[PDB]
Write a protein that binds this ligand. Structure first.
Ligand SMILES: O=CCCCC[C@@H]1SC[C@@H]2NC(=O)N[C@@H]21
Ligand SMILES: O=CCCCC[C@@H]1SC[C@@H]2NC(=O)N[C@@H]21
Ligand SMILES: O=CCCCC[C@@H]1SC[C@@H]2NC(=O)N[C@@H]21
Lengths: 91, 541, 82, 541, 541
């Protein structure tokens, strides 16, 4: 009420910890700031066959990728490439 | 069969009209003023205090709540403006305490967290009142209470307003004991120092969690121990998680850090063996047919102008569907049935001065809702009761009392929203704070006082005009405003929403565009408790 | 009833909300008006009320002029029968 | 696990048999007679009255019900034959009132509508009894009551049978007040004139609806006002929707026409915040394995011939599945468990003369059903109790009383269907009208009286044969039928189903092919009320 | 502390006044007429029947009651005039049954004895109604029922009005079963023949007593046994005390003669293990300050003249002390608190035409009594409701309904006394027969009907004057009384107290001088049952 929630979330790419600040906007979009760059991201999850797919727009660029989250790893498979990002495990 | 087509409320406002343009501009400024003030309160004690707090490895109080509640769930904060300019030279953002309702492990709970960055978490008189209000809300709705304890004790310079009385600090432990006896879970998370009465909070809780080094629980602090017995002992040795967890036994769970403690708290709530059950019928939710932000233009900030309360209703109820009861009788009052987020609700709203017919119509409506166990929503925009020799001869007071007496005895959940003025006995008839509505909210344009500022000025302008006309020394027109201007200033200052909200008279000042969401969250929380049968007194026919 | 032609039928004419002075008149003896067209402004116990057109019918006549005190529930405007 | 295969009741009748051909022909004629008589009653007052009714813009009473209930839903009308030939020279189709159970907004409700085309809607003595029976049904099953009020007041020539007594017109308002206190909604729709006591019906209702011009409410009519005070006032001015809606406040909703009022009524019911809950276990429905119309051939119209009641059961229960209890003990009575439209039911039916074993077997069965909260269905085809010196010595009266006492105290819903004779104390043991069954229906071939017509004739033929044999003047065989023929005629006339149904002794005469549907609707309505625990008296062992 | 001095009601009437002399003379004649008619009813069937009854060794029915009740205790007989001129050519003194309340072994019990001297004890339609009324009184007040059974069965010529319906003979056994389940003792004393349904009464009783030779019990009488099976058996062999006492087991006690059976009955009641407990506060009794016989002069027999109901109150309440409630508001109705024989009572009495204020005042008063659990006494002397256009516009019907609805829902014991007219809806508001007052009594000067005889005459004199004025054939003044005289005669005949009492509309016609005693006995009996909490419906404000 009267304020916006910003979530501080950390993900690890390779050996590098990345801090992303996600503000949950009223419209349902998310504004994410990594370092000094701010990105406007909107997205949905849709299922084709047995594979969940993520349809997302970052700063107006739109893309589709297959999303699998297994253990502490997020796997995004797209034609442009496959990226694997890790979720840090609490002590 | 629910396929019947029905009429809907609301009309499209004239956006081009000058009145709408002016009203929108004025209301928007009030909302912007409200938003930026909350932003400042969001920062608590300040950068230096916040930096010191983090330097000790502790989470900030609002970050603790974010991690405690379910991911992405809304959080209904209460009394954000408690202590706003309440004390002459001391700034106490939010009263030094953060209270609200959020979902933990799928269960609605009341969260009460001390703000250690504000005066080191000391308990000011408003701090006690805010906490007591939160406990009252939790008990009336059977909401489990979670205490994120990080406090510095009572504020000694104002002890007389904290310690002694029934509604003073002592009542906090009384409420904990009563809720525990009713199977309303009491969970305490010691994430910092708690001393003197503070140590009782973890001790009085059903289940208790303490952080490894930050948390400390002593009835007598090290300073008192040294004075009484001349011994030097650190806070950790006197209290500490290890002593209570392993030796004293005061601690039920031992946590490494703030994140670990919050994770443990979620596990504790999941083991409450509680499942929510609804006593009311439910229908699929529907959005209102009109934008909510149009309320800015419709209502404005000028209380002298009048608007149709039906317009407000049309923009908050599901599908803008409303069944009006006794539409043509006592038209200054509007009563009817609607639904908000699927819940059934009976709405009572002012549309003018209260009359004998209006009071009778309200009394009849309240009996209907109580019979069917339907929650009640009140929309207060009052300007007083009808004044006249004939009306008194016909027992307007007798009629007005009928409504005060029905509203008081009603046992269905009651929520009050002040969208305008709230003066005199009209406040009581429309379920004021004194009549225990489950929640009470006010719009940024509201005014509340014993009477309108002008009436008090005019009344005095009769008493002293009489005083000097009857005495015989003449009292001139300039003598009139040396009488009227101070009165009008006082009532304007003390009727301001921030003045009312700084003290805990309401549960918060809300943006009109957020009215539907706040009501939906509030009614959902109020339904955690079963609805009881209503017993009425004697209706003075 | 759903058509909203009924809304015109619910009341034949707009009446005075309360006993108060007429502060403004926006309609001549014969004037075409649409629903929501303000007809008169009345102040009662220092509280401003603006009377609005119930129907899109042209105005047959006006029962009050500016400065007149109108009693509660007294007809303010006459609309031509259609 | 419900996969067990079980045996099923019923056998294929011999369609070629002469008995079946004759029985089918006789029963068919009775059903055709029943159908055409209802068609005439359907027309109410007549063409001239109906034309006048429509000329005023009002809907016909049965068209009102059609529009009120959910589209396509069945309507269970009750006591269609009330007032049939009851009064010597006056025809009162249906008693001047239409009562039944239908679904409004998905809720089962009792609908009570005055038939203004019949004697202008005046209340005859049977009209009061029919309405009181409907109210009793609504209260016992917690069904909301909807009154479509269009009445002309009491019928003065028969005032002594309408006004004074406990079960007279005054009881109607008493029932409304009692149901309201129990949260059984009372909704009144004034679609016409209501005068004197009639004006109380809208006033005593929880929510009230009145039509714009047709409806009128006044304690004293214009004729009384003129006589008492010498003033001439129209009914609309004295009453009317506008006066009550806007000035008197008696009206809660204002309706333009009959269609609008019926639409408003559906909205009112939807806001009752009621949801039906079932206390009994439910299983999927199944149709009986045999055609229902075969009941014509099996039963016939000759009460002297006997048939196996199991054949009737096999054609109404789900899947023709029946678990008989104590099959070989007291075989003149059949008891067992079955299901109708998924509901569990315990069936008690006569298969001969009642014996001591039969009464004991019934008493045992009724205790079982009450313990498990299973609804009870009685199929009355009686011919009396066993007569004999030995049977009395063994306390047949003591055994018969055991059953009268168990049946009376049973609190499970009870429905009685008279498929044959109903004579003497056998009526009481099989849950007669005096024992408050939720519903009571009769087939067109039934006969009911204190005793069979022949027994009364033969008994008198003993008393006066004795009278003149003992006195000494001889009394010849021709003197016997000058005694017997008037008695047999009287009992045949007064035991006729139409005689019983013209007065409200049963809730209607039903076609045997419709037995399953009527029972399904009746049991469904009876389940709206929770089943209470049964408390028995002393069982005289 | 109860030593406060208080004011007392009542004034000394002017005995010399001509009005008092005339009123006393007229009322005295009515009382003398009432007394001598009861004397004739006291004789039952007659000398020949009484001589035959005694010749068989049996006591007369009224001598049985004298021996059953405690020595010297008063006996409150009910409906002495049932069946008075009810049937065209048959005289049925008291309906063939004697019912009343007396003390047996110190316990108040309801006594129901068949009068075998009247038509051999056959059950006429009024006989069933009188018995059913007695059972209703016993159940509502938890009074044990004692049946002195000596009956000849149903009256066959009128079987249709005895056997079939819910309130017909079958209901008698239903009531016995229900009372037994509630621990309201049912005791049957077979002092004669009981056949067919009669045999069920001893069988349905908790404890049963039968005389050695006079008593006989059998489902089927000897005449039916011979016809059915062609066997000749005496009544004693078929029934008899020995067979049931020793072989059938239907008899619990065996008595040598009538005196022995009555002695056994007293022993049975003494073993009920019952002790009376009072829910109300008690104060010492005091006699009224004015003679009761002065009521003759004050009231008279002319209903057109009016008297102050306070005068009636002053002569029946303890010490003539009365606390009036809302004395100056709605003065046509008198309400207040008093005490009769120490019991607290709230009195409501008519003092003129009912108005809106009177109805509101009554509704307020009834709520007060229900809240405090105070018994209510109604004194009906009505002349109608206020008739006027303004009154209807102000919702007189709405106000009158408020009282009908409060009176119906009241759960405190209610007793009604008709001391004057009782017409129209005024009857309902003042707790008429339809509203289940515990007892209802009427004075010999009372009149009851749908409306006053004159109003019906005048109303018709408007309808047909209109009929011929509007039609155009002139209708002269002599044509007016060919219309009015038959109507006035009918209403005078059907409104007579004996007409009302012959049918069971009231519980008896009582001498005004006996009003205080009858009320004291009635309230004392009504206090045997605990007073329940009152639940009201919706008050239509
Ligand atoms: O009074 C001055 C300080 C030292 C003495 C106070 C004593 S110590 C025992 C008791 N407990 C307290 O908290 N205060 C007193
Ligand atoms: O009695 C003849 C007709 C005119 C007088 C009847 C009066 S009017 C006041 C009161 N209310 C009634 O309904 N009837 C009487
Ligand atoms: O029907 C004429 C008289 C003899 C037969 C009547 C039979 S006997 C068995 C059964 N029980 C009665 O009371 N009546 C029938």
């Amino acid at each position: 009420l009267n304020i916006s929630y910003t979530r501080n979330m950390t993900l690890k790419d390779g050996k590098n910890n990345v801090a992303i600040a996600v503000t949950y906007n009223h419209d349902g979009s998310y504004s994410m700031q990594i370092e000094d760059k701010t990105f406007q991201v909107l997205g949905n999850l849709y299922s084709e066959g047995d594979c969940t797919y993520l349809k997302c727009s970052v700063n107006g660029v739109a893309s589709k990728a297959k999303l699998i989250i297994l253990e502490n790893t997020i796997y995004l498979f797209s034609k442009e490439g496959s990226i694997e990002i890790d979720i840090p495990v609490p002590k | 069969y629910h396929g019947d087509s029905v009429a809907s409320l609301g009309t499209q406002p004239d956006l081009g009209s000058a009145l709408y343009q002016e009203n929108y501009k004025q209301m928007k400024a009030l909302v912007n003023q409200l938003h930026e003030r909350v932003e400042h309160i969001k920062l608590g004690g300040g950068e230096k205090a916040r930096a010191l707090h983090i330097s000790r490895g502790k989470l900030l109080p609002r970050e603790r709540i974010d991690n405690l509640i379910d991911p992405g769930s809304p959080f209904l904060e209460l009394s954000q403006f408690a202590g706003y300019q309440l004390y002459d030279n001391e700034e106490v953002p939010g009263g030094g305490i953060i209270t609200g309702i959020g979902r933990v492990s799928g269960v609605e709970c009341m969260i009460i967290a001390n703000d250690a960055t504000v005066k080191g978490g000391a308990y000011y008189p408003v701090t006690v009142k805010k906490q007591l209000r939160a406990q009252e809300i939790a008990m009336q709705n059977r909401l489990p209470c979670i205490y994120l304890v990080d406090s510095g004790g009572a504020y000694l310079p104002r002890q007389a307003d904290v310690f002694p009385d029934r509604d003073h600090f002592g009542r906090t432990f009384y409420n904990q004991a009563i809720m525990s006896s009713k199977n309303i879970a009491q969970i305490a998370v010691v994430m910092g120092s708690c001393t003197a009465g503070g140590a009782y909070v973890p001790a009085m809780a059903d289940e208790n969690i303490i952080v490894r080094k930050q948390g400390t629980i002593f009835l007598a602090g090290p300073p008192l121990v040294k004075a009484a017995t001349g011994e030097e002992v650190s806070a950790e040795d006197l209290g500490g998680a290890d002593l209570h967890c392993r030796k004293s036994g005061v601690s039920d769970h031992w946590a490494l850090d703030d994140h670990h403690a919050l994770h443990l708290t979620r596990k504790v709530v999941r083991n409450l063996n509680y499942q929510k059950k609804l006593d009311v019928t439910i229908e699929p939710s529907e959005e209102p047919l009109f934008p909510a932000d149009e309320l800015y233009g419709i209502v404005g900030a000028n209380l002298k102008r009048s608007f149709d309360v039906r317009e407000v209703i049309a923009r908050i109820v599901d599908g803008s569907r409303f069944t009006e009861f006794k539409a043509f009788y006592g038209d200054t009052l509007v009563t009817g049935f609607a639904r908000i987020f699927g819940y059934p609700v009976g709405i009572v709203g002012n549309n003018g001065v209260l009359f004998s017919e209006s009071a009778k119509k309200g009394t009849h409506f309240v009996q209907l809702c109580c019979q069917r166990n339907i929650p009640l929503l009140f929309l207060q925009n009052i300007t007083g009761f009808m004044v006249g020799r004939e009306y008194e001869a016909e027992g307007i007071a007798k009629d007005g009392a009928k409504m005060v007496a029905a509203v008081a005895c009603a046992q269905v959940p009651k929520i009050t929203l002040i969208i305008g003025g709230s003066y005199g006995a009209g406040n009581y008839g429309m379920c004021g704070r004194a009549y225990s509505p489950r929640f009470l909210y006010i719009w940024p344009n509201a005014r509340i006082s014993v009477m309108g500022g002008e009436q008090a000025a005019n009344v005095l302008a009769t008493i002293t005009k009489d005083q000097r006309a009857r005495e015989g020394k003449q009292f001139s027109s300039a003598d009139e405003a040396a009488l009227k201007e101070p009165i009008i200033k006082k009532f304007e200052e003390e009727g301001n929403p921030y003045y009312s909200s700084a003290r805990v008279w309401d549960d918060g000042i809300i943006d009109p565009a957020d009215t539907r969401l706040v009501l939906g969250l509030s009614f959902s929380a109020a339904l955690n408790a079963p609805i009881e049968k209503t017993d009425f007194g004697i209706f003075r026919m | 009833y759903l058509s909203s032609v009924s809304s015109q039928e619910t009341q034949g004419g707009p009446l005075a909300p309360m006993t108060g002075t007429i502060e403004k008149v926006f309609v001549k003896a014969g004037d075409k008006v649409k629903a929501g067209d303000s007809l008169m402004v009345m102040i009662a116990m220092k509280m401003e009320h603006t009377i609005k057109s119930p129907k899109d019918g042209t105005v047959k006549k006006v029962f009050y002029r500016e400065g007149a005190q109108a009693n509660r529930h007294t007809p303010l405007v006459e609309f031509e029968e259609e």
